[PDB]
Amino acid sequence: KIFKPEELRQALMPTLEALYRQDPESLPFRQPVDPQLLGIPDYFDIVKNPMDLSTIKRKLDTGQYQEPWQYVDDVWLMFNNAWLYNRKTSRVYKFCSKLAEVFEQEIDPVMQSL
Numbered sequence: 321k322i323f324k325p326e327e328l329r330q331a332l333m334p335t336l337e338a339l340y341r342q343d344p345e346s347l348p349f350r351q352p353v354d355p356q357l358l359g360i361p362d363y364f365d366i367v368k369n370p371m372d373l374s375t376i377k378r379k380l381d382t383g384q385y386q387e388p389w390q391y392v393d394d395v396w397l398m399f400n401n402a403w404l405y406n407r408k409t410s411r412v413y414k415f416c417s418k419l420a421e422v423f424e425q426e427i428d429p430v431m432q433s434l
């Protein structure tokens with residue numbers, strides 16, 4: 321079952337754009353995590369596979385998803401990392417939860433049509 325990269329990009333990009341459109345909630349997820357800059361030096365001790373919106377976008381732009389479930393899994397990896405690393409009072413944790421609510425609504429019909 322083949323998916324062309326340009327085909328995946330057409331179907332999935334709007335679902336990623338939906339996440340970028342969320343303010344304030346997408347701001348902490350827009351760039352790769354830099355632990356030293358952010359003052360979280362144990363981040364890579366805890367989060368073994370960091371993921372962020374810019375990376376997911378670069379993967380779509382450069383044809384690095386073979387099939388669309390891998391994209392969904394990257395988005396969820398980004399959420400799961402934030403729910404693992406942060407406490408429940410943190411903005412980052414609560415913002416993650418909002419992004420996951422938005423993503424589910426967008427991704428559902430797109431995955432059904434694929």
Ligand SMILES: C[C@@H]1CC(=O)Nc2cccc(-c3cnn(C(C)(C)C)c3)c2N1
Pocket residue numbers: 347348349353358360401402405406412
């Ligand atoms: C997702 C990432 C890593 C994480 O899980 N927790 C985290 C902790 C502190 C700041 C951040 C954080 C990242 N960017 N920001 C900005 C305030 C937008 C610069 C804060 C943060 N977010």
